[PDB]
Amino acid sequence: MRTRSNITTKNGIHWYYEQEGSGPHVVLIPDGLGECKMFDKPMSLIANSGFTVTTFDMPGMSRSSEAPPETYQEITAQKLASYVISICDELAIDKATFWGCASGGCTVLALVADYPTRVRNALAHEVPTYLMEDLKPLLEMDDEAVSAAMSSNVVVGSVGDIEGSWQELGEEAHARLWKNYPRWARGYPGYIPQSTPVSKEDLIKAPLDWTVGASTPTARFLDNIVTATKHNIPFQTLPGMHFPYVTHPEVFAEYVVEKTRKYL
């Protein structure tokens, strides 16, 4: 039931998307790197609970790399939500549950803020509200091969596994990732965190549950816990850190299907 296809929305982004299952829609928005191979394992498990799961590579990244620059430069949470709604329209996805980590978490919050009608329920994980110190070196590195190396060693710091779950993403996926690192570095950390709608009025326009990785240092996403606690957004930790769908696919699937059926 795992269909793979491509499609172009009228904003010019030539997406690569995947779908599997039948039931209510559950969309898995990738993180900054925009590689939906990271959803390959848990997507089948989420679909096996009776849901149509949709995922895709993000504009300018991986197999969605055929996109205009603005879609991967000076990126805001509102730009990304605009792009996610466009493919959602093209796939007749009327309303869905949205997952998003990091930059994808900004996207879901922007979806709740500006497209609440379209979200049955949102789940955000480790959303950046500020520019993190260990990201600053990556910001405006002109050599793209140095940028990829430096970016890739900041990202594996954020992955919470050192025994192959990162490696078995494949060599094709890690090749696509190698081109993605410099493009993400130059478009996201200097532009997406300030745009994240964590406004008190913006978080309640739709159901939202919030998570942080159980093993990341408290100071990193402390703002996420305070923001979520100050506005009765349900908050919880998942295993691992920044990529729980990569390091803990089964527990991640149970969380996703638990939170979606709770609003069905």
Side-chain angles (χ1 to χ4, degrees):
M1 184 134 49
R2 175 75 77 83
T3 37
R4 155 215 321 177
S5 179
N6 51 75
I7 192 171
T8 289
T9 65
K10 279 211 173 328
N11 45 42
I13 310 173
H14 178 61
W15 304 79
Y16 164 96
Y17 71 102
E18 299 185 348
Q19 301 190 296
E20 158 167 14
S22 302
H25 290 293
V26 163
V27 177
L28 303 172
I29 311 170
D31 44 274
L33 313 178
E35 171 64 54
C36 81
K37 175 51 158 160
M38 297 172 165
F39 287 123
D40 180 23
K41 292 209 184 193
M43 163 170 27
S44 285
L45 313 169
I46 305 176
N48 290 345
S49 299
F51 304 97
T52 318
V53 202
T54 298
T55 201
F56 37 76
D57 295 339
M58 290 293 282
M61 322 292 250
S62 300
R63 305 158 277 196
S64 296
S65 41
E66 284 171 46
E70 54 245 43
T71 60
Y72 52 77
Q73 305 186 11
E74 312 166 1
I75 285 299
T76 83
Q78 295 78 27
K79 291 212 200 169
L80 294 186
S82 167
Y83 309 151
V84 187
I85 284 295
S86 88
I87 179 157
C88 273
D89 293 347
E90 285 293 339
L91 299 214
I93 296 168
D94 189 25
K95 172 183 295 178
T97 281
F98 295 86
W99 161 272
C101 166
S103 67
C106 313
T107 309
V108 310
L109 292 192
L111 287 169
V112 178
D114 299 333
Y115 309 68
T117 56
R118 308 298 293 277
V119 310
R120 177 204 309 120
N121 156 57
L123 317 163
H125 181 85
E126 300 197 350
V127 317
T129 43
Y130 72 120
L131 174 54
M132 294 166 175
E133 289 290 332
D134 61 348
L135 293 193
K136 280 166 182 152
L138 318 179
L139 279 196
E140 275 239 5
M141 178 59 85
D142 297 290
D143 193 309
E144 304 182 350
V146 178
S147 190
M150 291 192 349
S151 295
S152 64
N153 179 96
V154 182
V155 154
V156 288
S158 277
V159 178
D161 194 5
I162 65 146
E163 303 199 23
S165 54
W166 187 251
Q167 166 179 337
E168 178 206 311
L169 290 174
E171 327 170 18
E172 308 202 11
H174 279 293
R176 302 187 298 248
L177 279 176
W178 180 261
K179 290 203 269 285
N180 282 352
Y181 291 124
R183 181 165 299 188
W184 160 79
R186 221 81 37 204
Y188 281 63
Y191 300 96
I192 185 149
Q194 322 93 0
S195 75
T196 303
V198 278
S199 165
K200 338 289 180 200
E201 184 101 73
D202 288 328
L203 297 167
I204 84 164
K205 304 199 190 191
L208 166 77
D209 305 67
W210 207 316
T211 53
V212 174
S215 295
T216 87
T218 313
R220 267 222 151 225
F221 293 102
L222 171 58
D223 64 84
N224 280 214
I225 308 164
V226 175
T227 315
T229 302
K230 276 182 150 213
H231 305 114
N232 273 273
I233 298 308
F235 190 91
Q236 145 174 1
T237 43
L238 294 168
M241 307 187 235
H242 209 55
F243 303 81
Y245 35 94
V246 184
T247 57
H248 299 79
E250 308 87 349
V251 154
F252 168 81
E254 308 176 355
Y255 171 82
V256 176
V257 316
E258 160 178 276
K259 291 282 169 155
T260 325
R261 300 179 238 238
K262 100 155 199 186
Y263 297 104
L264 285 180

